[PDB]
Amino acid sequence: GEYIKLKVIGQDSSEIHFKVKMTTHLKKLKESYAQRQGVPMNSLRFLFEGQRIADNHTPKELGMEEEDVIEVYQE
């Protein structure tokens, strides 16, 4: 399996990029992002093409590709 780099855009326009395996559940990206922002994971919602990313969504399931963008909003 392969890895892709995703760009996570914060409410303040800051970015953290993540190298994620196509089969990894995106809960792990959500946890990492929230840890690095210093906020509870459940205070955030993560969107891809405006649609909510579930904990058990994989990049393969969502059709994600290299350099695709994820947006973070307050829950």
Binding site: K5, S14, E15, I16, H17, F18, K19, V20, K21, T23, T24, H25, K27, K28, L29, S32, R36
Partner: peptide, 12 residues
């Protein structure tokens, strides 16, 4: 800000 790339482990 500097570029930030985090590698997510495949171990869950």
């Amino acid at each position: 800000a500097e570029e930030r790339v985090v590698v997510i482990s495949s171990s869950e």
